[PDB]
Symmetry: C2
């Protein structure tokens, strides 16, 4: 149940072998995340600062509770 | 005549003020670049390794001679 990383379509854009497991292609932890109840302005600021399009949302134990993408904005 | 950086539309996606100069938004040097006469396989490998979409091509003196994008592939 641990958030070990994130896999986006920039990671698997040119992977010819589509039977490859996720663990060989994903981006490993630590990731850029936000706390629960993060406002939209703070999430957008994080996305602009780190120049990523995704932002996982985790609780106090570091367990995944949500995800914010640039698609929302 | 020096390559001081690169500006892509991920850098200027949420810039409300379009009168801002490039110098305040660009990604400053050093960049991930390739030498002249780089093959397609080497450029694609660099793009996959650094997870970027653009690769400036410079000469021995470090001056810009070309540009490769993921659009080509
Ligand atoms: N929150 C995050 N923390 C760390 N790395 C991340 C995070 N979100 C994405 N990445 C990584 O950053 C890279 C690009 O992220 P992003 O999600 O912006 O790309 P993308 O949506 O796949 O891009 P494109 O739309 O151009 O194909 C990928 O390697 C991805 O794994
Ligand atoms: N060769 C490079 N060296 C260093 N940084 C780079 C290079 N090319 C691009 N970047 C930077 O990496 C970030 C994303 O690069 P990229 O060109 O993949 O994004 P983009 O094409 O704008 O993305 P999207 O398609 O998701 O809108 C930007 O901050 C950009 O300035
Ligand atoms: Mg994008
Ligand atoms: Mg893209």
């Amino acid at each position: 149940g641990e958030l070990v990383g994130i896999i986006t379509n920039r990671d698997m854009r040119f992977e010819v072998d589509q039977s490859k497991p996720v663990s060989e292609v994903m981006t490993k932890a630590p990731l850029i995340t936000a706390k629960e109840g993060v406002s939209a302005e703070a999430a957008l600021g994080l996305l602009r600062r780190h120049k990523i399009e995704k932002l996982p949302i985790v609780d106090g134990h570091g367990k995944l509770t949500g995800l914010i993408t640039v698609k929302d904005f």
